[PDB]
Enzyme design. Structure first.
Site, PDB file in Angstrom:
ATOM      1  N   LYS A   1     -15.179  -2.963   5.402  1.00 19.60           N
ATOM      2  CA  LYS A   1     -15.417  -4.166   6.473  1.00 19.60           C
ATOM      3  C   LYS A   1     -16.768  -4.558   7.049  1.00 19.60           C
ATOM      4  CE  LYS A   1     -10.702  -4.801   4.972  1.00 19.60           C
ATOM      5  NZ  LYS A   1     -10.654  -4.454   4.099  1.00 19.60           N
TER       6      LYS A   1
ATOM      7  N   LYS B   1     -12.875  -1.682  15.626  1.00 15.55           N
ATOM      8  CA  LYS B   1     -12.222  -1.531  14.449  1.00 15.55           C
ATOM      9  C   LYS B   1     -12.380  -0.596  13.916  1.00 15.55           C
ATOM     10  CE  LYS B   1     -10.958  -6.290  14.083  1.00 15.55           C
ATOM     11  NZ  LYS B   1     -11.160  -7.643  13.167  1.00 15.55           N
TER      12      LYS B   1
ATOM     13  N   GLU C   1     -15.802  -6.037  17.775  1.00 15.69           N
ATOM     14  CA  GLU C   1     -16.206  -7.875  17.915  1.00 15.69           C
ATOM     15  C   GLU C   1     -15.610  -7.912  18.965  1.00 15.69           C
ATOM     16  OE1 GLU C   1     -15.468  -8.831  13.264  1.00 15.69           O
ATOM     17  OE2 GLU C   1     -13.239  -9.006  14.314  1.00 15.69           O
TER      18      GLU C   1
ATOM     19  N   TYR D   1     -12.673 -10.459  21.047  1.00 12.78           N
ATOM     20  CA  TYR D   1     -11.361  -9.970  20.622  1.00 12.78           C
ATOM     21  C   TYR D   1     -10.845 -11.353  20.809  1.00 12.78           C
ATOM     22  CZ  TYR D   1      -6.663  -9.172  21.505  1.00 12.78           C
ATOM     23  OH  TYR D   1      -5.506  -8.980  21.538  1.00 12.78           O
TER      24      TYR D   1
ATOM     25  N   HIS E   1       1.717  -5.668  13.028  1.00  9.98           N
ATOM     26  CA  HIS E   1       0.606  -6.476  12.362  1.00  9.98           C
ATOM     27  C   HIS E   1       1.228  -7.434  10.515  1.00  9.98           C
ATOM     28  CE1 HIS E   1      -1.586  -7.171  14.466  1.00  9.98           C
ATOM     29  NE2 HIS E   1      -1.932  -5.599  15.571  1.00  9.98           N
TER      30      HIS E   1
ATOM     31  N   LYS F   1       2.874 -10.035   8.108  1.00 10.95           N
ATOM     32  CA  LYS F   1       3.483 -10.959   7.636  1.00 10.95           C
ATOM     33  C   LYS F   1       4.249 -10.753   7.520  1.00 10.95           C
ATOM     34  CE  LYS F   1      -0.074 -12.145   5.912  1.00 10.95           C
ATOM     35  NZ  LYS F   1      -2.035 -11.792   4.858  1.00 10.95           N
TER      36      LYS F   1
ATOM     37  N   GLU G   1      -9.115 -13.678   4.080  1.00 13.81           N
ATOM     38  CA  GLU G   1      -9.025 -13.977   5.873  1.00 13.81           C
ATOM     39  C   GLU G   1      -9.711 -14.265   6.954  1.00 13.81           C
ATOM     40  OE1 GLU G   1      -5.914  -9.981   5.419  1.00 13.81           O
ATOM     41  OE2 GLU G   1      -4.294 -11.610   4.761  1.00 13.81           O
TER      42      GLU G   1
ATOM     43  N   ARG H   1      -7.559  -8.744  -4.565  1.00 10.31           N
ATOM     44  CA  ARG H   1      -5.896  -8.919  -5.300  1.00 10.31           C
ATOM     45  C   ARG H   1      -5.429 -10.097  -4.783  1.00 10.31           C
ATOM     46  NH1 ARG H   1      -3.700  -5.225  -0.707  1.00 10.31           N
ATOM     47  NH2 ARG H   1      -3.284  -7.433   0.251  1.00 10.31           N
TER      48      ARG H   1
ATOM     49  N   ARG I   1       9.834 -13.461   3.959  1.00 14.69           N
ATOM     50  CA  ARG I   1      10.084 -12.148   3.477  1.00 14.69           C
ATOM     51  C   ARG I   1      10.791 -12.164   3.912  1.00 14.69           C
ATOM     52  NH1 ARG I   1       4.440  -9.084   3.618  1.00 14.69           N
ATOM     53  NH2 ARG I   1       2.991 -10.483   2.941  1.00 14.69           N
TER      54      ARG I   1
END
Ligand code: OA3
Ligand code: CL
Length: 445
Positions: free
Chosen positions: A116, A159, A201, A203, A236, A238, A276, A292, A338
């Site tokens: 990351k 993170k 980062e 938030y 977290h 989807k 994302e 991917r 889903r």
């Protein structure tokens, strides 16, 4: 075109890639665990190989077995789908080294975007908007780290550089909790990833989750196929996705899409990929790249006409992108639910045998699943058993189609999220559109 490929996956995506191969005249090889002998795509494949026992670690994550299987069957390429080995740089490296085509990015690229910290830096260099952050790993100097926090502004979020998607990361609101949180996130990541690197980062309090679909050949061409919104999610994960994202204007789409396309050219990206972004206050911020295909790809497909899996095979066969940017048009709207095998009261995975199955049909209804009547859902794998995708000329038509399609779906013998899905479709805020990544859990408790 590729003569014969191995489908290094299972479940719904394995079947998905099987149809793609079949339509293209490509021979299929289904590698499966001993518990997956009765998968739909395994019964459909031209050739099957058992690559090991039930556990994923000894089967679908078993690199040497997968390559032996590609070797014995005379395959030329290996499609890893999503999850498992799709973002394993050493897998990708060994496939190529063994002489196969890896259906996906070059090993270096996976390695670059699978870290990351290195991912965010390549994104920053290419001109991709990111979250204000530490622009590197955090040191053991706590004067520095308190000042980095000051420099960005609390709340900040520690993170993991190896982790992602809620894995090994926590929110810090003041100075007192920063000391403890850094060393805790450092150890948690040292646990499952064997990497202690962490960063900082800003938030974001209430972001939406908007991500951009890209395709790229190995050869200096790259395109974007609009965006998807995937804010409706649980711990977290989807739960519902849709394309395009409500509220996103053609101007903004062009803006972020052009940046993502450019980024593909700067990093030498190959095959399908998603950038994302958290989306707040009219701003985008990169948070990770999936090098991917994604679970939710079918939403993009419906609105654009693009067979993403077939493009993946075409790019793998070394074909340059036949589709120019100015050919790609957004038309209509698509939502995906889903379908999970889980207790609606506990959310614990609910494996077992399906006693009665009935899929929805009709104009605009797309059903992506390996399940049939009599099929047994094993306890060893992910709970997601199917994906229902409804398209329509506009968003309200697509939603109304999803409502009616979910009421036609019958899966007896195991517990499902179907009725949660029904309840999400009826939500008055989801119907207005634009709910944030906290919405679903707020609606539930
Ligand atoms: C996955 C997640 C934890 C989502 C989130 O809330 C968030 C945030 N608010 N700011 C930065 N990064 C993130 C990543
Ligand atoms: Cl995914």
């Amino acid at each position: 075109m590729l003569d014969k490929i191995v489908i290094a996956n299972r479940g719904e995506i394995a079947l998905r890639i099987l149809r793609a191969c079949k339509e293209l005249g490509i021979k299929t090889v289904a590698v499966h665990s001993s518990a997956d002998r009765d998968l739909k795509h395994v019964l459909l494949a031209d050739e099957t190989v058992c690559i090991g026992p039930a556990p994923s670690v000894k089967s679908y994550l078993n690199i040497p077995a997968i390559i032996s299987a590609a070797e014995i069957t005379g395959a030329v390429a290996i499609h890893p789908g999503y999850g498992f080995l799709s973002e394993n740089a050493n897998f990708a490296e060994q496939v190529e080294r063994s002489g196969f085509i890896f259906i996906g990015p070059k090993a270096e690229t996976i390695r670059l975007m699978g870290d990351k910290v290195s991912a965010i830096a390549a994104m920053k260099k290419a001109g991709v908007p990111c979250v204000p952050g530490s622009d590197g790993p955090l040191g053991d100097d706590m004067d520095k780290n308190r000042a980095i926090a000051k420099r960005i502004g609390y709340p900040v979020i520690i993170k993991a550089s190896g982790g992602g998607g809620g894995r090994g990361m926590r929110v810090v609101r003041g100075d007192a909790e920063l000391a403890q949180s850094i060393s805790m996130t450092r150890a948690e990541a040292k646990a499952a990833f064997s990497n202690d690197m962490v960063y900082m980062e800003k938030y974001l309090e209430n972001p939406r989750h908007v991500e951009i679909q890209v395709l790229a050949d190995g050869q200096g061409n790259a395109i974007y196929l609009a965006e998807r919104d995937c804010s409706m999610q649980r711990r977290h994960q989807k739960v519902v996705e849709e394309a395009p994202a409500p509220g996103i204007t053609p101007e903004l789409r062009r803006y972020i899409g052009e940046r993502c396309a450019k980024a593909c050219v700067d990093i030498g990206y190959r095959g399908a990929g998603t950038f994302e972004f958290l989306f707040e206050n009219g701003e985008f911020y990169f948070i990770e790249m999936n090098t991917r295909i994604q679970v939710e790809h079918p939403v993009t497909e419906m609105i654009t006409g693009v067979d993403l899996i077939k493009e993946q095979l075409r790019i793998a066969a070394g074909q340059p992108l036949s589709i120019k940017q100015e050919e790609v048009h957004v038309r209509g709207h698509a939502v995906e639910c889903r379908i999970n095998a889980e207790d609606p009261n506990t959310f614990l995975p609910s494996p077992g045998k399906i006693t009665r199955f009935h899929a929805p049909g009709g104009f605009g209804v797309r059903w992506e699943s390996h399940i049939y009547a009599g099929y047994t859902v094993p306890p060893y794998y992910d709970s997601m058993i199917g994906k229902l995708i409804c398209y329509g000329e506009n968003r309200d038509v697509a939603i109304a189609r999803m409502k009616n399609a979910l009421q036609e779906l019958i899966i007896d013998g195991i517990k499902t999220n179907v009725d949660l899905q029904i309840r999400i479709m009826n939500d008055e805020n989801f119907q207005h559109g634009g709910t944030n990544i906290h919405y679903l859990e707020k609606k539930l408790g």
